[PDB]
Every structure is written in C-alpha cells, then in structure tokens.
Amino acid sequence: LKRMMPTSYSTAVANAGRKAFFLNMYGDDKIYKPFPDIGDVIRPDGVIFAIRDHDDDLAPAEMTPRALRTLDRTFDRAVIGTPGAKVIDIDIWRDERVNPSPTPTGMDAQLVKYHTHLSSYYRELLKI
Amino acid sequence: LLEKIGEDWSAAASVKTQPSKLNNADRASTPGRETAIRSFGESETRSYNCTVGPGPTAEILDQTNNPLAHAAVIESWLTAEKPSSVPVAVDREKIPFGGSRPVAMFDHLLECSGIALEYAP
Amino acid sequence: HKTKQRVTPGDIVAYNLDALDVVKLVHKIDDTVPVELIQECLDCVAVTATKDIYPHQILLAQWVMHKAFPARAFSHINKNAVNHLLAAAQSLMWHWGFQQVAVFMQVELYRIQIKYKDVMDELYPHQRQQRAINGVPVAPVNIAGIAVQSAHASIRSSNWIYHGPDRLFKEAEQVTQNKVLVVPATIKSVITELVIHLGKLNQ
Amino acid sequence: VVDHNEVHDQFTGKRIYANDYNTSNSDEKEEFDRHFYSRLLHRGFERGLNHFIDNFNEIFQFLLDANIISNNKSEFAQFVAQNKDKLFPKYLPVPSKLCFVATTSGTYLDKPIEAAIDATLSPIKAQNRTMRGLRLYGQFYEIYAKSRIAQKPGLARRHMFGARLNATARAVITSISDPHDYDELHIPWGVGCQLLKYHLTNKLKAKFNMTTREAFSFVYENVLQYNQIIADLFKELIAEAAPYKGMGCTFHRNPTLQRGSTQQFFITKVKDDINDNSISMSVLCLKAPNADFDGDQLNLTLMPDVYLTKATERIAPHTWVLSIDEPHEISGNLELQGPVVETIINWAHEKYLPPLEEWLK
C-alpha cells in the first residue's frame, strides 16, 4: 500500500475586508503570517487562514498579541484542509481603490509580498 | 486504485438551526462535515412506530424538533459525573410534550383556517 | 436574544455552566488571588439579580478574563451567568489594585493623552488607519483608545447606586450622604492604566 | 371547529386586532409591511363553481334556507345544524410572520404567497370587497394546503415525521474478521472525535483542570491527529457503561423495507488509524439488510439515555432470527458466508480416515 499512494491537489479560498480580518498563525509574536509560504508545511491541525470578525469595543480583549495567536473554534470562521501537505501555489487579488483601509497596520506584509510580484508580472505581460 | 475513497464522512453532535436544523452552504470550517444526517425518513419512523412502541419513538423526534430538549441533552451530558449511561436527560415534568416546531406551525396554520384536530369519547 | 452570526446550540449551554465556576475562571488568569476576596464579591450576586445589566459592565467584564472566557459569548448567555462573571471581574479588578474602577461592576441605575500613548501604541501595534485630506497622510489612531473612550462615555452617562461589598467602598475614597456614586475626574486615567496592565498580561 | 371570538379576547399580547381596519397605505408600506407581514365556508361550500356561482347572494345571508342541490353528501345539513357558528364573528386571525419568508440582488418570493392582497384593502362595493377578500382567503388556504402540505416535499411528509436528527453520523462500512461478538461496532477516529465532543469536554473538565474553551480547542485540534489522551478518554467512556458492552447506538439502511434494515449495536472500540474512515460491522449482521461494500454510505444515530437504550431493544440483531414466513424455521439470514463455509468444507469433507471396513480389520 506504500507503492499505491495517490496524490490530491486541493484549493482553499478566503476573503478578508471590511466585514472581517485575518489571524496570526504560523509564527511567533515578532512576525505576522496569515498563511504559509509557497513550499511550506501545514500545521498538525488543518486550520489555514482563520478569520475573526471586525469589532471596535473588543480591542483590549481580542486585538491583543495573545488572542491573535490562539484560535477560538466558535465565534470564528476557519478553513480546514489536510494536516500533512505542501503548499504549491498562492494567488492573491486585491481591490486597492478604497480610500479607507479596513485592515489594521502590521497585517498586510505577506499579502503585498505576493501582490507586488503578481502585479509586476501582469504589468510586464500587458507591456509586451 | 479506484474513485470514491473514504473521505465523504460526517459526524455532528450539534448542528446550527434555522431562524429546522438544515444548513447548506460552503461548509469547510470544521474537520469533517458537521451537517445533520436525515437518518429518520417516513419509512424509518414508520418502522420505528411499529417495531419500537409509539411512545419512545416520539422522544427521538422531540429531542431534535424542540431546541429546549436539544439544550437539555447537552446539559445532562455536561452536568453528570458519567457522560455515558445517563438514566434521564429530558424529564417530562419541566419540558413536557407539545413544543414541537412543525407540529405547532401546522396547528397554527389549521387554527387560522378555523378548524382543529382533536378527539373526544 | 440571539444574533445573525449563527452559533451552534449546545455550545451555548456549555458557557452557561462554565460561567458558574468562578474560582477556576479567576485562577486561570491569576492564581495568586485569595478565596475570601472572591467570596466577598460572590455574596453580592443575590441582591443584583433582580436588577438590570448595562453595557459598561459588559465591556469591563469582556475586557478582562479573555484568557479563560471568550468575549463574544457575553451576548449569548443568561442573567445568572453575567452576574457571576461581573462578580469575578470585580474580584479580579479588586486584587490588581484598580479600586477606583471596580466599584462600578455591581451597580443599579439611579484619543490617548501623552502620559500613556507611547506604551499603548507599543502593546497594541495594530492601529486603525484614517482617511487623509488634500494629501498629508495622517498617523493611524489606536483602536484601544476608541474602546476606552467609549467606556469613559458609558461610565459618565448617568448617576449610579452602589450594590456591593462595603470593604470595596472603604478601600477607595468615596464620601456618601446617600447611596449614590461620585465619579472622579481621573477616571479616564485609571482604565487606561488597566488596559496597559491587560497588555502586560497578554503581550 | 374553533370559536374565533374565543381566541381574540384571550390573546393578551399586543392586541393589534386592526390590521387593515386602520392602515390605508399612506407612506406606511415601508413600516407596516416589513415589520409585520413579510371559519371560511368557501372551503366546504365550494361545489358551485362549474360555469356559474350560486354564491351571488352577497351580504346578509341569514342562512335558514334548506335548498340543497347536491348528490355527494346528505349529512352536510347535520354538520351545519350541529354547530351553527360558522364565520359569524368579526375577528378573523392573521397568519404569523414565520409562514412567509422574504437578501440578495433580487428579491425572491414564492408563488403560493397570495394573501398580501387582503392587507392592501357606498356600502354595496365595500360589502362586495369583504367577500372578495374572503374568497381570496379561501383561495390562499386551499392552494397552501395543496402545494405546501399535500406535496411530498412539505410540512407533513418531511418535517412532521422527523428529519435531520442530532448526534448522528453517516459513513461507509467494512467488516470485522476477528474473534468478536455479534453486536460490536468500531467507530473511526474522525467520526468518534466529533460524535463525542461534550463527553470529551466533560472528561477533560473532570480529569484535568481545563476550561470549556481549551477543551473545545483540544477536541477540535486532535480530530485529524492521533494522541494518547483522547484515546484513553475514549477507552474510559467505553468502560463507563457497566451493564452494557459500550454506548448503545442505532444503525440504519437507506432502503428500509424489512426488519433487519434498522438495528441496534454497541460502540466497543475506537480505531487508532486516522486514515481509516469507515464503520466496521459484524459479519453475521451483513445478511439481514442488503448491505455490501460497494461504496454505500450508511447512517447511525446515538442513543443518549438508558431508558432509550432499553426501549430500542425491540430492534436487535437477535430479533430477525426467526422467520416471518414459516411457522417453525429460522430464516436464511443466519447462514454463514462463502469463505466461512469453505474452510469447514475443506476440513470436514476430506479423506481423513480409512472407511469402516478397513478400520475394524
């Protein structure tokens, strides 16, 4: 049965804007990473880019570096996949015409790290 | 190897309810499915009415159609010193029979028509 | 009685039963709390059970004890749960030395300054971006400052009547000719001293 | 037959009896419609609508004329004279907000909802409009009892007879080829980790010093991950059943015609392999339902109580042993399988000993 081992390719998609924002997994208290990088390993639990709702009065309770690391199974919206799996592809779309930024600061580094490369690729593709 | 390996399994001790416990959306927020499985059809409740007595087969539907009994079974699971082998979960002295949601909906819809389904010797 | 953010029925009754375990809920946050200090706040739940709950108490109980109880479960629990949670939050704020704010827990109805801004922007780095006007992009404002401003607006909205332990009334300096509260002028400075402490236990 | 005047003076609620009697839709469709709305002789006395209507007598009937031209029933006059109070009071009730469901880019409504015409409204015209609204009431209630009750997708045959029960599971099946008992079920790790969640929460709040949030995180984290503590708590939860072999559960088949399609088993062992997602069943119980290993998904319900487990003893694997056709004969569901019989055939029916002539010579 080790020689009969099929391969499964899966795709998980999520959104985070004015309604809700991301969570801080896959890292310590000095870095922010809402999703694993290309060529990384998923956690022993299958939660990838868990989403927390957007509130204002719960800022010292929920918008603290202790609560951004832990995941509540209720009052949240996570995405469960495969625990042991390698990340192959990442595609990020972004609306960048809104004058209020709904996401707080310090959470949009890994997003723009892929978005700038994708925008440069599509810009060269249109320039040709 | 062939198609249809074992991955389309489901297990749910508690499911979200309708604003009556049916949900159909992009349900990928839990490891495995959390949807309620319609194990009791019309032929299933007919066989459970004939083989099992008509008394104890209404409690299985009343533990689902009534949200108070659905809260009471979890309260009895969480308040007992033994989670298994609990004698009584929903006693009929505090939460009696007659609080089913589709039964009361049908009774209200027939009451606005002007008639009622009762009996008398 | 319920919100459109749909939660499973069955998780509601678990938080109804875990909120009555006051001692385990306050020992998960800080284990060095005396039991009689919890009991003196816990004996007052029989008087405030026939009263109303106001959102400043819900905010002050949702801010603290987030390490052992979720804040979003406060809008999906009953009255006997929030009374014990208010007693637990009153004991937890009485032990930490914030006696000027812990009086307003069990009660019946009758930006950030320069002294704390540098550490409040350090303990809470995620800030709310603001809209610029004719260019000149302004610095983002802190969301915890908005939260403590909303709490300060909720505290000073009306007059208050104390229903709690007399030892807490004798610890803090408040004069009385009848059973009415007196709001101090420095009440915005103590709650900001609490949240920073709430930053120091979490971050 | 219910007295409509008895239900409108014992309401003791909001007592808003005037719904159409006060409103006139003068800038009120934004408030009165969305916040509130979002014994009918015409049902029984409806044998006169072929190409002519015998109800052209509009108002002030004073029904005492026994002019009955009808061949279907003769006890209709006795039904009238038994309870003469029929559509006499002035207080007719309004259906609740739960009966009508209103979103998205396009407002979607359902075609049996044709009762909002009564909410939007000389005496000889108003008296005709009241009976027009009464005929619209009858036309709404008949089509709502025909299209939402009488259909197989409906309130009666789908929701009033039970649907979508809790504490249930649905998975494919394998067999147990082991020394075991005839009533033993093997629940896998992923099914057993979600079917027993509050039991694990109780065991983690009792044996360990954990809150319900940490217990829920420990339950939901180890669904696709094996660990020793959850397995030991599963073995403890199996061992807690003192007079039974484990937790009593019911097991169904989707075509349910015979007795063997609905059985009661006992959960006895939770599997350790996380990749195996299948419920392993006994060999001897494979024959009473038509269940094979052809990728079929089978349903399972969990009995919570001891009284319910004692009441579910009427459907058991031993109940279908005796046949329902012959008076003194055990049915063919007790027969063993192919490879079980073939080893006994190769063992017993073998040239093992010399015959009886050579044995005593």
Q: A86 has which bridge partners?
A: A41
Place of tokens 């459907």: D315
| CA distances (Å), origin A38, targets A90, A113, D115, D126, D250 | 7, 12, 58, 75, 46
Q: d(Cα D80, Cα D237) in Å, to the nearest integer? A: 63
Q: d(Cα A83, Cα A78) in Å, to the nearest integer? A: 14
- Orientation angle between helical segments C55-63 and C143-155, nearest 10 degrees: 140
Q: Distance, in angstroms, between C32 CA and closest chain D CA?
A: 16
| Closest residue of chain B to C3, computed from CA coordinates | B19
Q: Tokens standing for A112?
A: 């723009």
Q: d(Cα D290, Cα C112) in Å, to the nearest integer? A: 73
| CA distances (Å), origin D206, targets B12, B72, C19, D100, D203 | 23, 20, 16, 47, 5
Q: d(Cα D297, Cα D212) in Å, to the nearest integer? A: 33
**Amino acid symbol at C108:** E
Q: Can you say whether the dihedral through the CA atoms of D220, B83, B101, B48 is positive or negative?
A: positive
Q: Distance, in angstroms, between D7 CA and closest chain A CA?
A: 42
What dihedral angle (degrees, nearest 10) is formed by the CA atoms of C85, C89, C91, C96? 160
Give residue numbers after which chain B breaks (C–N above 2.5 Å).
19
Q: Which of B8, B51, B115 sits opposite D259 (nearest CB)?
A: B51
Q: Is D304 helix (H, G, I), strand (E, B) or coil?
A: coil
CA atoms within 13 A on the CB side of D181: 14
Q: Do C25 and D211 touch (CB under 8 A)?
A: yes
Q: d(Cα D231, Cα C65) in Å, to the nearest integer? A: 31
Of residues C93, C106, C76, C85, the one with CA closest to residue C20 = C85
Q: Do C14 and D212 touch (CB under 8 A)?
A: yes
Q: d(Cα D42, Cα D138) in Å, to the nearest integer? A: 6
Chain C residues lying within 8 Å of D213, measured CB to CB: 68-70
Contacts with D242 (C-beta within 8 Å, 6 or more apart), sequence order? B85
D280: left (phi over 0), alpha (psi -120 to 50) or beta: beta
Q: d(Cα C165, Cα C181) in Å, to the nearest integer? A: 14
Q: Tokens standing for D139?
A: 């036309």
Resolution (A): 3.3
Q: Do B112 and D94 touch (CB under 8 A)?
A: yes
Q: Do C9 and B13 touch (CB under 8 A)?
A: no
Quickly count: other Cβ atoms within 10 Å of residue D174's Cβ.
15
Q: Do C147 and A29 touch (CB under 8 A)?
A: no
Place of tokens 């009696």: B96
Q: Tokens standing for C87?
A: 């007693």
Q: d(Cα D175, Cα B63) in Å, to the nearest integer? A: 31
Q: Distance, in angstroms, between C129 CA and closest chain B CA?
A: 30
DSSP for B45-110, written as a single string: HHHHHHTS-TTTTHHHHHHHH-HHHHHHHHHHHHHSS-SSSBS-SS-TTTS-S---HHHHHHHHHH
Contacts with D60 (C-beta within 8 Å, 6 or more apart), sequence order? none
Q: d(Cα C45, Cα D291) in Å, to the nearest integer? A: 59
C-beta of residue C121 within 8 angstroms of C-beta of residue C144: no
Chain D residues lying within 8 Å of A72, measured CB to CB: 213, 217
In chain A, helix, strand, coil percent, each to 5?
Answer: 20, 10, 75
10 Å CB burial of residue D89 (0-12, 13-18, 19+) is: middle
Q: Does B38 lie at the interface with D, CB-CB under 8 angstroms?
A: yes
Instruction: Work out whether strand D279-281 and strand D173-175 pair parallel, antiparallel, or are unpaired.
Output: parallel
In the C/D pair of chains, how many CB contacts fall below 8 A? 20
Quickly count: other Cβ atoms within 10 Å of residue A94's Cβ.
13
DSSP for D130-148, written as a single string: HHHHHHHHHHHHHHHHHHT
CA angle, corner C137, sides to C134 and C138, nearest 5? 115
Q: Does C17 lie at the interface with B, CB-CB under 8 angstroms?
A: yes
Phi–psi pair at B103, nearest 5 degrees: -70, -45
| Closest residue of chain A to D216, computed from CA coordinates | A73
| CA distances (Å), origin D50, targets C83, C124, D46, D68, D89 | 68, 78, 10, 16, 30
Residue C161: its H or E element: strand C160-162
Say which DSSP state D155 is in: I
DSSP for A27-78, written as a single string: S-TT--BSS--TT-B--SS-B-S-BEE--STTHHHHSSTTTTTS--SSSSB-
Q: Tokens standing for D3?
A: 């007295």
Q: Which of A56, A58, A99 sits opposite C71 (nearest CB)?
A: A58
What dihedral angle (degrees, nearest 10) is formed by the CA atoms of A36, A41, A44, A45? 30
Distance separating the N- and C-terminal Cα atoms of chain C: 34
CA atoms within 13 A on the CB side of D16: 9
Q: d(Cα C158, Cα C183) in Å, to the nearest integer? A: 10
Chain D residues lying within 8 Å of B30, measured CB to CB: 194, 220
CA atoms within 13 A on the CB side of C151: 29
Q: Does C72 lie at the interface with D, CB-CB under 8 angstroms?
A: no
D29: left (phi over 0), alpha (psi -120 to 50) or beta: alpha
Contacts with C174 (C-beta within 8 Å, 6 or more apart), sequence order? C103, C181, C182
Q: Which of D213, D221, D225 sits opposite A72 (nearest CB)?
A: D213
Phi–psi pair at D32, nearest 5 degrees: -75, -25
Of residues A70, B116, A73, the one with CA closest to residue D6 = B116
Q: d(Cα B6, Cα D269) in Å, to the nearest integer? A: 19
Quickly count: other Cβ atoms within 10 Å of residue A44's Cβ.
13
Q: Do D224 and A45 touch (CB under 8 A)?
A: yes
Instruction: Work out whether strand D298-302 and strand B10-12 pair parallel, antiparallel, or are unpaired.
Output: unpaired
Residues 17-46 of A with CB under 8 A from C: 29
Q: d(Cα D100, Cα D33) in Å, to the nearest integer? A: 12
Q: d(Cα D356, Cα D358) in Å, to the nearest integer? A: 6
Q: Tokens standing for A30?
A: 């000095």
Q: Distance, in angstroms, between C184 CA and closest chain D CA?
A: 37
Say which DSSP state D36 is in: T
C-beta of residue D136 within 8 angstroms of C-beta of residue D117: yes
Q: Do D211 and C18 touch (CB under 8 A)?
A: yes
Q: Distance, in angstroms, between C8 CA and closest chain B CA?
A: 5
Q: Tokens standing for C90?
A: 């009153």
Q: Can you say whether the dihedral through the CA atoms of C90, C93, C97, C103 is positive or negative?
A: negative
| Closest residue of chain A to D224, computed from CA coordinates | A45
Chain B residues lying within 8 Å of D149, measured CB to CB: 106
Distance separating the N- and C-terminal Cα atoms of chain D: 96
Chain A interface test: which of B29, B30, B34, B74 (most A C-beta within 10 Å): B29
Q: d(Cα D264, Cα D296) in Å, to the nearest integer? A: 19
In the A/C pair of chains, how many CB contacts fall below 8 A? 86
Of residues D138, D121, D110, D123, the one with CA closest to residue D53 = D138
Of residues D83, D61, D68, the one with CA closest to residue D4 = D83
Distance separating the N- and C-terminal Cα atoms of chain A: 50
C-beta of residue D2 within 8 angstroms of C-beta of residue B116: yes
Q: d(Cα C194, Cα B22) in Å, to the nearest integer? A: 44
Q: D250 has which bridge partners?
A: D264, D301
Q: Does D218 lie at the interface with A, CB-CB under 8 angstroms?
A: no
Strand ordering across the sheet containing D279-281 = B10-12, D168-171, D298-302, D247-252, D262-270, D185-187, D279-281, D173-175
10 Å CB burial of residue D38 (0-12, 13-18, 19+) is: exposed
Residue C143: its H or E element: helix C143-155
Say which DSSP state A80 is in: B
Q: Distance, in angstroms, between D225 CA and closest chain A CA?
A: 7
10 Å CB burial of residue D41 (0-12, 13-18, 19+) is: middle
Quickly count: other Cβ atoms within 10 Å of residue D242's Cβ.
8
Of residues B3, B11, B13, the one with CA closest to residue D278 = B11
- Orientation angle between helical segments C55-63 and C79-95, nearest 10 degrees: 60
A contact chains, 3+ CB pairs < 8 A: B, C, D
Of residues A123, D287, D212, the one with CA closest to residue B75 = D212
C-beta of residue C194 within 8 angstroms of C-beta of residue C147: no
Of residues D26, D43, D37, D4, the one with CA closest to residue D114 = D37
**Amino acid symbol at B79:** T
CA angle, corner B86, sides to B80 and B91, nearest 5? 95
Q: Distance, in angstroms, between C72 CA and closest chain B CA?
A: 17
Q: What is the CA radius of gyration of chain D?
A: 33
Phi–psi pair at D137, nearest 5 degrees: -60, -45
| Closest residue of chain B to C8, computed from CA coordinates | B16
C contact chains, 3+ CB pairs < 8 A: A, B, D
Chain A residues lying within 8 Å of D220, measured CB to CB: 45, 73
Q: Which residues of D touch C (CB under 8 A)?
A: 198, 201, 205, 209, 211-213, 216
Q: d(Cα D38, Cα D26) in Å, to the nearest integer? A: 18
Q: CA C104: distance to chain centroid? A: 9
Q: d(Cα A24, Cα A16) in Å, to the nearest integer? A: 13
Q: Do B112 and D206 touch (CB under 8 A)?
A: no
Residue C109: its H or E element: strand C107-109
**Amino acid symbol at A14:** A
Q: d(Cα C198, Cα C201) in Å, to the nearest integer? A: 5
Q: What are the helix (H) ranges across C19-64?
A: 22-27, 35-42, 55-63
C-beta of residue D301 within 8 angstroms of C-beta of residue D168: yes
Q: Is D249 helix (H, G, I), strand (E, B) or coil?
A: strand
Q: CA D343: distance to chain centroid? A: 45
Residues 288-327 of D with CB under 8 A from B: 295, 297, 299-301, 304-308, 311-312, 314-315, 319
- E-state strands within chain D: 168-171, 173-175, 185-187, 247-252, 262-270, 279-281, 298-302
Q: Does A85 lie at the interface with C, CB-CB under 8 angstroms?
A: no
Q: Is C165 helix (H, G, I), strand (E, B) or coil?
A: coil
Q: d(Cα C142, Cα C146) in Å, to the nearest integer? A: 7
